[PDB]
Design a protein around this ligand. Structure first.
Ligand SMILES: NC(=O)C1=CN([C@@H]2O[C@H](COP(=O)(O)OP(=O)(O)OC[C@H]3O[C@@H](n4cnc5c(N)ncnc54)[C@H](O)[C@@H]3O)[C@@H](O)[C@H]2O)C=CC1
Ligand SMILES: Nc1nc2c(ncn2[C@@H]2O[C@H](COP(=O)(O)OP(=O)(O)O)[C@@H](O)[C@H]2O)c(=O)[nH]1
Ligand SMILES: [Mg+2]
Lengths: 205, 177
């Protein structure tokens, strides 16, 4: 059983319980990523985790890895967290029109499911997420993912200026090279609206 | 460096996401357009000050009226947009956008932006808007509107061509200070 936060109050309270005493450099590295994450992740994915090409990032990444690697930097309980992704997350062959008029292309969806459902993956890039579902990009994008995070996982929780350039996202940032398994991929309808969205359930391994 | 927050609101499809993109990449997007753009801090200097402006994109549709407010706290400036190719969106400025903002960001400076300035003298637009007895919004209308809603200023631009884009942000930045 994993905790899921109902509202800001819960989100906020859970947040107080997390580790917040990163070193100044630690704080800086985390905040830098939040300013723009395109630079870190895009590069790592393109380079598969080898940091040799751009020294200027090397320190940048090597540096964030530490903040995230501290022993105190983990999550107490088992928490469900959420993330929103564009359709291309499943490959360059797809775009957001995949959903038109609140309908997910079934032919397109099924190909994705066969391809990715039950798949275990390693992500080169960091994985930004939110403990609050309404926060973040989960409702504003085509694919919403709920990550089941096992206790003891290493991460940074950010909801303040020191920590992130975008306070208010109730963010939990997971380390790069994190590995996860996609348990289920499915279509679900939104309460009160008629739009389907692609939903992914994945567990952190 | 000074940290400031900018939130952009406006009707759906009025061109918001594209505007920010082009602002940070000098590249109008054509095939992989995100509904809502990602976190990006814009680096800007005006009148001798270097500013880091975080830009928050939003979904203007009613479906997201419940979620939008989570983006409003502690905002320094707002970009209220409408499309020059759509008079319908402009009307929503007073109708929907101004009321929501004053409520959530009561004292925040507002900058009214007319997007898709390239569609002002576009035949297709003109004609297409003709089928409804409407025509592209006139510059005078926006200024008039800005005055009406208490905006700090008014600007026009075209993401597609990048006209004035750099201008919108600089202004937003001044108002932020
Ligand atoms: N996704 C969310 O809802 C949350 C986002 N954030 C913030 O947003 C940033 C990270 O999320 P994004 O804005 O999506 O940037 P990102 O680096 O996660 O991805 C940016 C774009 O690339 C796509 N992408 C992501 N991972 C991919 C992969 N493995 N392969 C192919 N394409 C991929 C995404 O769909 C998005 O369209 C961070 O700065 C973080 O602070 C924070 C908390 C939750
Ligand atoms: N002609 C023209 N089209 C634009 C411009 N900016 C955006 N668009 C188009 O208008 C549509 C809506 O843009 P988007 O930025 O997604 O709107 P948002 O929903 O308000 O973020 C897209 O199809 C764009 O192709 C512009 O400056 N000129
Ligand atoms: Mg948009």
């Amino acid at each position: 059983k994993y905790k899921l936060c109902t509202n800001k109050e819960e989100a906020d309270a859970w947040g107080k319980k997390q580790f917040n005493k990163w070193s100044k450099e630690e704080k800086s590295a985390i905040r830098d990523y939040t300013k723009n994450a395109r630079p870190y992740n895009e590069f790592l994915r393109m380079h598969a985790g080898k940091l040799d090409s751009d020294p200027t990032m090397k320190k940048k990444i090597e540096s964030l890895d530490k903040a995230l690697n501290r022993k105190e930097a983990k999550v107490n309980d088992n928490i469900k967290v959420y993330r929103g992704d564009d359709a291309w997350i499943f490959g360059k062959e797809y775009d957001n029109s995949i959903i038109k008029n609140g309908k997910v292309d079934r032919e397109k969806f099924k190909e994705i499911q066969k391809k990715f459902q039950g798949k275990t993956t390693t992500e080169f890039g960091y994985i930004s997420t939110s403990i609050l579902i309404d926060a973040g990009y989960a409702k504003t994008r085509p694919v919403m993912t709920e990550f089941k995070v096992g206790s003891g996982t290493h991460g940074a929780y950010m909801n303040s200026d020191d920590l992130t350039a975008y306070p208010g996202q109730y963010e939990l940032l997971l380390p790069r090279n994190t590995v996860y398994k996609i348990e289920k991929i499915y279509i679900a309808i939104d309460n009160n609206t008629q739009k389907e969205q692609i939903k992914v359930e994945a567990t952190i391994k | 460096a000074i940290r400031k927050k900018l939130v952009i609101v406006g009707d759906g499809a009025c061109g918001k996401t594209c505007l920010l993109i082009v602002n940070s990449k000098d590249q109008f997007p054509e095939v992989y357009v995100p509904t809502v753009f990602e976190n990006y801090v814009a680096d800007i200097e005006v009148d001798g000050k270097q500013v880091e402006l975080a830009l928050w994109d939003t979904a203007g549709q009613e479906d997201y009226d419940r979620l939008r407010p989570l983006s409003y706290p502690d905002t320094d400036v707002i970009l209220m947009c409408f499309s020059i190719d759509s008079p319908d969106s402009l009307e929503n400025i007073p109708e929907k956008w101004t009321p929501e903002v004053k409520h959530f960001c009561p004292n925040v400076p507002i900058i009214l932006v007319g997007n898709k300035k390239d569609l002002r003298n576009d035949e297709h637009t003109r004609r297409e808007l003709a089928k409804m007895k409407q025509e592209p919004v006139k510059p005078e209308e926006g200024r008039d509107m800005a005055n009406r809603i208490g905006a700090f200023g008014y600007m026009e631009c075209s993401a597609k061509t990048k006209d004035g884009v750099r201008e919108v942000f600089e202004m937003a930045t001044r108002a932020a200070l």
